[PDB]
């Protein structure tokens, strides 16, 4: 298992524009297009992202290309962030994947707001971080996915994904 397979499980793959759990136009493997309620705005963000006239449908290769860029962007967002970077550097490889998963889902600023959780993660207080992580809109809105990510931070294993 790895970050790619982990996010593929958590996000799924859809080849036609869909609404994500928040109601936002999304495509592929959790690639958010726009927060605007306009499907036309989505389609135009999508043509721009793919570089051709898609009319709201993309191939699997194209979904996987966006996915690669988004995993890459999430890692870079962590490394460029003063609050995220030192926690990430402190983590083993499995728990680093949980951090990328979170940034992917909610962005760099969202995650950087888990101030107390970040500190407990840095100190390797795993059970306490896990309790704190769960007290969040994140966990209440997407409990199954959040439980999987939390268990990964808690145990440092891929058990929640097998
Ligand atoms: Cl893009
Ligand atoms: Cl979920």
Ligand 2 centroid to Cα of residue 10, in Å, is 8
Proximal ligand: closest to the CA of 47:
1
**Angle CA 35–97–116, to nearest 5:** 75
- Residue 104 marked in a binding site: yes
Ion ligand 1: protein residues whose beta carbon lies under 5 Å: 49
- Residue 2 marked in a binding site: no
**Angle CA 146–105–113, to nearest 5:** 80
- Residue 90 marked in a binding site: no
CA–CA distance, 155 with 162 (Å, rounded to integer): 14
CA of residue 74 relative to chain centroid, distance = 8
Ligand 1 centroid to Cα of residue 142, in Å, is 24
CA–CA distance, 62 with 109 (Å, rounded to integer): 27
- For residue 51, the 8-state DSSP code is T
> Please, what are the domains in the chain?
1-162 (1.10.530.40)
Proximal ligand: closest to the CA of 141:
2
CA–CA distance, 46 with 68 (Å, rounded to integer): 16
Structure's resolution in angstroms: 2.2
Q: What is the DSSP string of 55-78?
A: TTB--HHHHHHHHHHHHHHHHHHH
Three-state helix/strand/coil letters over 73-141: HHHHHHHHCCCCHHHHHHCCHHHHHHHHHHHHHHHHHHHHCCHHHHHHHHHCCHHHHHHHHHCCHHHHH
- Residue 117 marked in a binding site: yes
Q: Are 10 and 138 in contact (CB under 8 A)?
A: no
Which amino acids are annotated catalytic?
A: 11, 20
CA–CA distance, 78 with 15 (Å, rounded to integer): 28
């Amino acid at each position: 298992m790895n970050i790619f397979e982990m996010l593929r499980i958590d996000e799924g793959l859809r080849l036609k524009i869909y609404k994500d759990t928040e109601g936002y136009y999304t495509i592929g493997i959790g690639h958010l297009l726009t927060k605007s309620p306009s499907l036309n705005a989505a389609k135009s963000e999508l043509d721009k992202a793919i570089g051709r006239n898609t009319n709201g449908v993309i191939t699997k290769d194209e979904a996987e290309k966006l996915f690669n860029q988004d995993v890459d962007a999430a890692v870079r967002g962590i490394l460029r962030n003063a609050k995220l970077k030192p926690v990430y550097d402190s983590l083993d490889a499995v728990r680093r994947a949980a951090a990328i998963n979170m940034v992917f889902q909610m962005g760099e600023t969202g995650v950087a707001g888990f101030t107390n959780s970040l500190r407990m993660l840095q100190q390797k207080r795993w059970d306490e971080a896990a309790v704190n992580l769960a007290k969040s809109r994140w966990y209440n809105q997407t409990p199954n996915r959040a439980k999987r990510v939390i268990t990964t931070f808690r145990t440092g294993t891929w058990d929640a994904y097998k």
